[PDB]
Write a protein that binds this ligand. Structure first.
Ligand SMILES: COc1ncnc(OC)c1C(=O)Nc1nc(C(F)(F)F)c(-c2ccnc(C(C)(C)C#N)c2)s1
Lengths: 607, 71, 76
């Protein structure tokens, strides 16, 4: 009775006098010990106490209601089990009054709470705060610091960090620390104004060391690797090129302007865990993660883009052109073998070469399939190779049905040359917009046109009358009619009104209808490929070119042995700290816009 | 084309949905009954239709809500 | 229900859910003499109510009708 009375009095908060009177009455009842006051001052359903209930309903009276409540809890000296009390329901398991005060942006009351000994590292590991399916729950890091940082509350973030009891290196039920959470909730500038990057910088340089960035969560990823796994481009572009110009914290940076003289400057980026020389690099993640759909932007970032460029011009261009040449010669050999089929000079040399090349590339593509318009070329290359090998094995065998497989393999390898004509800008754009046509639009056009063919063929062959000279009318059996309709679509059939029809006017009407409607489908296809793709063709061509180049470069990188890879070893050495000597990647630059008296550099004298 | 296609498709889909809506009997329609119940006033209990949302732009100290405990 | 940047607005369906003689939704869809519905059918409860009716029963009934008509066509 009095429990719900005080609960409603504090939730409404319409006055503090009656809540003070209720507190006095409860104290009188408790006098005639602390466990009883707690049991009477909380609701044993979830554990929601009067403090939590007050904070949930912010009315202009809370600023004094909470003070009265803390004074009362100090009268019995139960503040410990009072403020640090938490929920028990399976939804908000562990949720504490501090996360409630922060979620409602009450900074002054948060101060009054922490001054009252509010447990600052209380982990809210409830099934609501760690939701599996999004849109039902709000994952934020499960810590008051994580909360005040994800909901853009820098005042309270500083208020928590300046405190001593805080623990910035804390790890939650998912293994994350504060930085993993900031990475997890960073969406995009168009929807956030990018405060999470600011809070990232603040929290990072406040705990000044590599403690936060070096830990991994229960997925075995670091905040850098984490923002790489998801598609967080902004946070990534910050972490990769982060310059800290203060002296004592300069060691935390990942880009050191070390050489600037005038409008020219040589930023010296970092390649600690970016250069694919680790288990899961940021680069191999950014290229091999195909479930993010933002890489067209992430592969233009500071060290990633030029590292791809350097690996390319160092070895990948060479290996890729070698592969193109080998495949072209294998294809010309298939062509000549097909042409000069038997109606060891032409047989043994060429046949053994195509055998070995096809078997090795088929094993390669097959084991490539076993990893999990982007990468179906593995499928089609493997299919063509198996086709060649089956054709030649049947030729060796007692089956003269080998020529079909052989010539189909040749036509398919010449089709697969489309993979290797991704290389230069002209051929890249050409090949990829050919692919866009073929896959996007002409295929559905072919489907609807085949439905046209089926319907009009059965109609016409149903209108025909058997000739007493059955060849007196070309639209005879169904397949004949379909062939004539095909030829009419391409422009080779014949329009003769005397098709031995029983309703020549109606038959002519149906035929004109078919040719008109397939003409209309041609026009519709033309508009679909001349108005829609023409806008984004330039951009899609470039992004697909870039992604395929990244994949090929990183694939060749694996195809090489350890010693040769170490012989390539993109990047240099560079001393930046007392003893750091971490890898780096120089990038010269020129900027005439922002003039600044240079203060930070590694080399006083520009080299 | 891109906009007109979608607007005419949306009109068609609305018409078909509302069409089918009528093609069904009263009992089955009541068995579908999009929406839930919800108490807002002293005694209102009118029909309602929940819509979750996410907005990072406008931060406000939440003052009004039905269920203080988020489910 | 709002907690942080997440929130659960609880719209109303008093005279909108076609369970009345002349509801707002059946008016908004069956009035073809206004020529603005391409915008009105994107409003707050109307759009998602169409979506929910669809995914609940209309997708099924429409696909059933398509299948029946396709079989009638192939048998013709
Ligand atoms: C540059 O290509 C060539 N250069 C020299 N000679 C050639 O033929 C001897 C060729 C050639 O096109 N070969 C082909 N084989 C086949 C196949 F039957 F295996 F499918 C091709 C085919 C068939 C149907 N749909 C496609 C789509 C639209 C998906 C595409 N793309 C491709 S195409």
């Amino acid at each position: 009775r009095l429990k719900k009375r005080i609960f409603a009095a504090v939730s409404e908060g319409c006055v503090e006098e009656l809540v003070e009177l209720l507190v006095e009455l409860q104290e009188l009842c408790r006098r005639r010990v602390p466990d009883f006051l707690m049991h009477k001052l909380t609701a044993s359903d979830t554990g929601k106490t009067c403090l939590m209930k007050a904070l949930l309903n912010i009315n202009p009276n809370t600023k004094e209601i909470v003070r009265i409540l803390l004074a009362f809890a100090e009268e019995n000296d139960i503040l410990g089990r009072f403020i640090n009390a938490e929920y028990t329901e399976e939804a908000y398991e562990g949720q504490t009054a501090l996360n409630i005060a922060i979620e409602r942006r009450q900074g002054d009351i948060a101060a009054l709470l922490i001054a009252a000994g509010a447990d600052v590292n209380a982990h809210a590991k409830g099934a609501f705060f760690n939701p599996k399916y999004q849109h039902e729950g709000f994952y934020f890091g499960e810590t008051p610091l994580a909360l005040a940082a994800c909901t853009n509350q820098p005042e309270i973030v500083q208020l928590l960090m300046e405190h001593e009891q805080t623990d910035i290196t804390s790890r939650d039920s998912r293994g994350n620390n504060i930085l993993h959470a900031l990475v997890t909730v960073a969406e995009d500038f168009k929807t956030q104004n990018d405060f999470v990057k600011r809070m990232y910088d603040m929290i990072l340089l406040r705990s000044g060391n590599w403690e936060l960035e070096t830990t991994r969560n229960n997925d075995g990823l670091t905040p850098l690797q984490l923002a790489a796994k998801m598609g967080k481009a902004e946070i990534l572009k910050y972490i990769l090129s982060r310059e800290i110009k203060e002296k004592r914290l300069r060691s935390l940076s990942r880009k050191f302007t070390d050489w600037a003289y005038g409008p020219v400057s040589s930023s010296l980026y970092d390649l600690t865990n970016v250069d694919t020389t680790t288990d899961n690099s940021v680069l191999e993640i950014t290229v091999y993660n195909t479930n993010i759909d933002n890489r067209h932007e992430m592969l233009t970032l500071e060290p990633l883009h030029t590292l791809l460029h350097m690996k390319w011009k160092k070895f990948a261009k060479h290996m890729f052109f070698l592969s193109f040449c080998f495949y072209f010669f294998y294809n010309i050999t298939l062509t000549l073998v097909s042409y000069y089929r038997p109606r060891g000079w032409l047989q043994l040399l060429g046949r053994m070469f195509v055998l070995i090349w096809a078997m090795c590339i088929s094993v390669k593509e097959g084991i490539a399939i076993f990893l999990l318009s982007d990468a179906w070329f593995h499928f089609v290359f493997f299919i063509q190779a198996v086709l060649v090998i089956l054709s030649v094995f049947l030729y060796l065998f007692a089956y003269k049905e080998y020529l079909a497989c052989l010539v189909l393999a040749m036509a398919l390898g010449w089709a697969n040359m489309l993979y290797y004509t991704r290389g230069f800008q002209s051929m890249s754009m050409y090949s990829v917009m050919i692919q866009k046509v073929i896959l996007h639009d002409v295929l559905k056009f072919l489907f609807v046109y085949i439905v046209f063919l089926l319907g009009f063929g059965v109609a016409l062959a149903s209108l025909i009358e058997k000739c007493p000279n059955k060849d007196c009318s070309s639209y005879g059996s169904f397949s004949d009619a379909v062939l004539e309709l095909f030829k009419l679509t391409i422009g080779l059939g014949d329009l003769n009104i005397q098709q031995n029809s029983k309703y020549p006017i109606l038959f002519l009407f149906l035929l004109i209808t078919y040719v008109i409607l397939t003409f209309v489908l041609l026009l519709n296809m033309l508009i679909a490929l001349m108005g829609e793709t023409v806008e984004n063709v330039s951009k899609e061509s470039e992004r697909i070119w870039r992604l395929q180049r990244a994949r090929t470069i990183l694939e060749f990188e694996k195809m090489l042995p350890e010693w040769l890879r170490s012989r390539f070893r993109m990047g240099e050495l560079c001393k930046v700290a007392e003893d750091d000597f971490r890898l780096c990647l120089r990038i010269n630059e020129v900027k005439w816009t922002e003039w600044k008296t240079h203060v930070s550099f590694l080399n006083e004298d520009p080299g």
